[PDB]
């Protein structure tokens, strides 16, 4: 019910504007809140906005750092972050303060927007196949995958067969290489007897570099 | 018709 | 700002066993209207937070009844009567009485299950990457428990150090297992100096270490 904008790479001192599109409910009847997650053990409330009249309330820590607006015609909320520092690299959520049983709470959340503050240039990944073979068979099952190497910044999106293959997929958390670039793998287990008839394509989308790659993983001899 | 919420919003 | 303290930091619970998490506020969360604005949230890995309970004790309609909440005005507890696989993640308390909203430290819940041995796979470097001058060799450990595992790379039966990186998945939300990958990275020149590439896997679920090897060029 809430769709947020894509990941952002921002140079230090610049600004960024991220959006939160609402659908399927009365936009002006519910507060839209924003939350900052710096890491897995930190959640901070940034502020809220009343889309009816655009009234805003902010956490004192984010005044002069953030500004909330809405466009009623498109039922979208916006948050602009100003003059970013490295401490502004985080994942940003929007949430609706919904209503149930006469009480109010955050009942719908956006998927989150990753903002990375860095002066480094973006780099798209190169995608290499992890081809199945006798070296990757176990108990009648075969393992195959994609190696997504040397990209900046995070994140990269990996799907299989345009999202039709989800069972048995493991997309590993990226690692930081000594070059400062990232790499990850995505793997899936399938029947070994299926390698002649089935098609396995990993879809790699790295939005900071506008990099979209499809690699068909075929068996090695 | 208007939005309400938990008081910590201010 | 209200300070919200959570205990424990991390928790490991077997499927079907009870779980308990506590939250403490630096001031009373009872508001003038008589409502205690204390919320519990769950955040599964790679997903947004999700409100489980509001007003100390009230469940969101889509939350199973094995979750429950109790508390006073400053001390609160979230209880899971019988933990299931989907209950992994980090739990936060959020106070909504005093401006601004403040979240707790967060409590990590790991799901305990029976030992599961890894299926071990190795992937030689692709021809496409070899033309680019680098060789990445990947060793895959699939669907294992517990999380501790040791993966050693051997090149011509010589133990390797300083040229590999590993990454573990989050705990699986259905079977509570983990997966691990170890990536050995070499230049095309150094890769061509040797013939046999192997990863040796030691894990609690394996009675002896498992070796997956290949010869360069097959």
Residue numbers in the entry:
A (entry chain A): 3 to 52, 52A, 53 to 82, 82A, 82B, 82C, 83 to 100, 100A, ...
B (entry chain P): 2 to 11
C (entry chain B): 1 to 27, 27A, 27B, 27C, 27D, 27E, 28 to 213
Paper lines:
Circumsporozoite protein (CSP) is the most abundant protein on the surface of all Plasmodium sporozoites and is necessary for parasite development and infection. CSP contains an unusual central region consisting of multiple, short amino acid repeats whose sequence depends on the Plasmodium species. The PvCSP central region is composed of nonapeptides GDRA(A/D)GQPA and ANGAGNQPG characteristic of strains VK210 and VK247, respectively. The central region of CSP is immunodominant, and antibodies targeting the repeats can inhibit sporozoite infection.
Next, we co-crystalized the 2F2 Fab with five different peptides derived from PvCSPvk210 (210-1, 210-2, 210-3, 210-4, and 210-5) to gain molecular insights into the binding mode and cross-reactivity of mAb 2F2 binding to PvCSPvk210. 2F2 also binds the 210-5 peptide containing a unique repeat C-terminal of the central region (1GDRAAGQPAGNGAGGQAA18); however, the electron density of residues 12–18 C-terminal of the bound core peptide motif is weak in the co-crystal structure, thus providing limited structural insight into this peptide region and suggesting it does not make strong interactions with 2F2. The recognition of PvCSPvk210 peptides by 2F2 is mediated mostly by residues localized in heavy chain complementarity-determining regions (HCDRs) 1, 2, and 3, and kappa chain complementarity-determining regions (KCDRs) 1 and 3. The PvCSPvk210 one turn of a 310-helix is positioned in the hydrophobic pocket formed by KCDR1 residues of the antibody, and is stabilized by three H-bonds formed between A9 and the backbone of K.Gly91 and K.Phe96, and G10 and the sidechain of H.Ser58. To accommodate arginine residues present in the sequence of the PvCSPvk210 peptides, the 2F2 paratope has an overall electronegative potential. R3 and Q7 play a central role in mediating the Fab-peptide interactions, forming six H-bonds with both heavy and light chain residues of the antibody, and contributing ~107 Å2 and ~ 156 Å2 of BSA, respectively.
